[PDB]
Design a protein around this ligand. Sequence first.
Ligand SMILES: N[C@@H](CCC(=O)O)C(=O)O
Ligand SMILES: N[C@@H](CCC(=O)O)C(=O)O
Lengths: 251, 251
Amino acid sequence: NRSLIVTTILEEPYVLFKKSDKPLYGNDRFEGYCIDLLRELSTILGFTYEIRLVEDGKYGAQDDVNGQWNGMVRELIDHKADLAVAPLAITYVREKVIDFSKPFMTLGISILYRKGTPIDSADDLAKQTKIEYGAVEDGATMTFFKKSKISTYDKMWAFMSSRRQSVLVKSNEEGIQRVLTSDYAFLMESTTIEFVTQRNCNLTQIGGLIDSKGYGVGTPMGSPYRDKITIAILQLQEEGKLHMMKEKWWR
Amino acid sequence: NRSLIVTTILEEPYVLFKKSDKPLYGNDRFEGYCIDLLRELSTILGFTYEIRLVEDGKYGAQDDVNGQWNGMVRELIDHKADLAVAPLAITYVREKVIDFSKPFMTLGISILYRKGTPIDSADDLAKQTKIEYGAVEDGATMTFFKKSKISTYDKMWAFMSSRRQSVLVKSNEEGIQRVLTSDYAFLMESTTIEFVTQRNCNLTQIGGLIDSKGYGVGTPMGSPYRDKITIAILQLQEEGKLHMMKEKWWR
Ligand SMILES: N[C@@H](CCC(=O)O)C(=O)O
Ligand SMILES: N[C@@H](CCC(=O)O)C(=O)O
């Protein structure tokens, strides 16, 4: 049984490079919530693996022109990876091209901004054009706005799209920095906002959740590993290990 | 200027009877997040007040037979109170009969159950008839299910409705006890689940948020106080006082 190739993406505290004085090798080079999850999956299901960072640095979205996918989603479609273990949102459009396990974490889209301001909701941001706002390019949040039919979200996308290169960023980290250095509000996932606000007393979530979704392990469509992984995840959930993992990495 | 009559309801940690070795009088007889909020409103807007407990002990729903409202909603409609300061959900159906200030807290409907079970979502509950589940009678959660057109929620309401007397309860506290003593799952608001799971290590939230809403101060339709209260709440939110109040009562 050859090792499985697992694609992922850098994103604290799910996946990060492990720091050490002595040279690190193999799977020990990475750490995080998803790295701990992957380890548990491997021993419960009996497989060895190698971690690969998604080459184009993206989560995954479909191209308007050629309709092709990119990111981790595309790597799965082309069989360049056996699994995708990262904070990968389970979405209807993605389910048309790849398979997902049951979710290992639930969350929703929300807003990150500085505290001490009069902005209290997405409506407050959408009714003005002075304060800029955006999201991670080629990710699930950007896609949510791009496909939304809800007036407020639809005009917010018209805004983002018209200033795409200035307001859509390559990573959550870039988005956080943009919030701390300019009149900018960032649309990101609640679980990540929780982590961020706990470490930056000047930041806060604005309003509640704009939607509801979950993170799941991705596999190429038809993979025999998808149902096995769901079994492993449910077991970890039931015994309280996923809760323990969240507490460990979020604190 | 006569003092305002403020209706509310017993619900920890928003409203509870204050304990003391010595006799308590007037507004000092109560305490909680909503009691602190009410005090702040009174000094910012300049009014005196008296706290009243909703007489029929309900939040508010429309009667299936005669369409009449009950609970705090009805006390506002009948002008038995000037304001309703409690964890009162801002809903479309309620907005048709009373007015609400902007939200002072955001939340969503979710599931409370024992940990260590294979139940992981509302779907896991809806696909079986053994484990019973319910909600607070005449509250926003019940109304959400009664009016939902979403298949899963629609079949869950059919279930609750068909066993109404056995599964709907008079209070969140009754629901919590039902969960701790029988094979029962309880549909309640996330902010309350947060408080409960923090004090009962054997309980946990199941799945994510089923919907998104907020709590606001209610007033009789057309009341000149509604816009004034919104101004007060936004001020408290911006200065971080609402955040401080949440941390104080949830810990
Ligand atoms: N977690 C998202 C990326 C970040 C975001 O869209 O907020 C995804 O799976 O695409
Ligand atoms: N907060 C709810 C009551 C509790 C519930 O419905 O879960 C209301 O305002 O009706």
